[PDB]
Design a protein around this ligand. Structure first.
Ligand SMILES: CC(C)[C@H](N)C(=O)O
Ligand SMILES: [Mg+2]
Length: 364
């Protein structure tokens, strides 16, 4: 006997350039927690249902997990775009959802069954603008790009634009693109003609990487910030040496000294031969929230005897009250499921000259 927890992430499509790191973190969590006896001796069982890259696929994944797989709760989905469509399904069904990486404004507000462990754009994004200004205090002109079809990108770009204004900088253009575009020559040229000192990009990974590469190809030599959708080593293949120097805010640091981060990091590095990325740590934290909440609930009200609808409702109630020492740091939730988290960072892509290898360097 095991306790089923649903994992609904993008395992296919270009959205999997983000989702695959989340899957990796979830699997590390499953082993970590099951090796510790699961829920008071009862193992958990992660049930993975691929969402693919759109809303329909996410809705289908959620419905399958809820109805066929009888899960006690869901971790997912990957994108805020998917969450706004699918999370109401879980809300209506009274099944908890813990978002690992949905950072758009409004996610926890979807309902009483929706929480997230991922700090939102309003607190994450401004960090990278400040870091760019530290590296070049003479930045004056800023060009902004965003994916107009993606909910998170639209939410993130508003924060970047407001931050640019509040820092007293000149916003010289806002250019739009689609996440499915591969070519950005006209937008990139129109921005470059305005002589920006800083370029900020809110898109996802393939699109963001292609845009970075093209800006450099077209002669742009200024600073570049990527938003959360570029926050993956999967961009390295796309922009190669021309990824070098891109600044990306972080809601996780491998060097954070919390005991569980040490264990998570060691497990990750031993397997993948590089530092754990933010998305992996966030997925681990989401699974941790479920395991620790299930343990607390089970101690007070043995879960093997609770029928599923009540188990789901009691688990949701429990998780919202918990405090968790996770790889992300000490976190908890507001009464509506927003994460409470203290520390943020900025990292910078450092490519090797040949362009075939790189890493994220954390700024001090
Ligand atoms: C990069 C992506 C996972 C983004 N944080 C979102 O909310 O969709
Ligand atoms: Mg909520």
């Amino acid at each position: 006997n095991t306790i089923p927890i649903g994992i609904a992430l993008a395992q296919t499509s270009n959205v999997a350039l983000l989702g695959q790191e989340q899957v990796a973190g979830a699997k590390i969590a499953e082993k970590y927690f099951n090796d510790k006896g699961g829920v008071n001796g009862t193992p958990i069982k992660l049930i993975f249902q691929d969402t693919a890259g759109d809303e329909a696929g996410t809705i289908n994944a959620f419905q399958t997990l809820i109805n066929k797989d009888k899960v006690v709760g869901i971790v997912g989905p990957t994108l805020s775009q998917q969450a706004f469509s699918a999370n109401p399904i879980a809300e209506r069904a009274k099944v908890p959802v813990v978002g690992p990486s949905n950072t758009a404004k409004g996610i926890p507000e979807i309902g009483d069954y929706v929480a997230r462990v991922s700090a939102p754009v309003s607190v994450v994004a401004p960090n990278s603008v400040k870091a760019a200004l530290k590296q070049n205090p003479n930045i004056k002109k800023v060009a902004v790009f965003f994916a107009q079809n993606d909910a998170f990108s639209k939410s993130e770009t508003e924060i970047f634009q407001q931050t640019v204004k509040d820092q007293g900088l000149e916003l010289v253009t806002v250019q739009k693109f689609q996440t499915t575009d591969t070519d950005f020559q006209s937008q990139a040229t129109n921005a470059i003609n305005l002589k920006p000192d800083l370029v900020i990009i809110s898109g996802l990974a393939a699109d963001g990487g292609n845009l970075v590469r093209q800006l450099r190809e077209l002669g742009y030599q200024g600073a570049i910030i990527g938003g959360d959708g570029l926050n993956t080593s999967n961009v390295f293949a796309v922009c190669k040496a021309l990824c070098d120097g891109v600044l990306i805010a972080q809601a996780y640091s491998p060097e954070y000294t919390g005991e569980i981060n040490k264990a998570f990091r060691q497990a990750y590095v031993d397997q993948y031969k590089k530092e754990p990325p933010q998305f992996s740590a966030q997925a681990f934290a989401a699974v941790q929230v479920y395991v620790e909440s299930l343990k607390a609930l089970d101690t007070k009200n043995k879960v093997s005897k609770i029928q599923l609808p009540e188990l789901r409702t009691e688990l949701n109630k429990q998780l919202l009250t918990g405090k968790y020492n996770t790889p992300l740091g000490e976190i908890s939730f507001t009464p509506i499921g927003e994460v409470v988290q203290k520390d943020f960072y900025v990292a910078q892509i450092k490519m090797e000259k040949d362009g075939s290898q790189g890493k994220f360097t954390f700024l001090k």
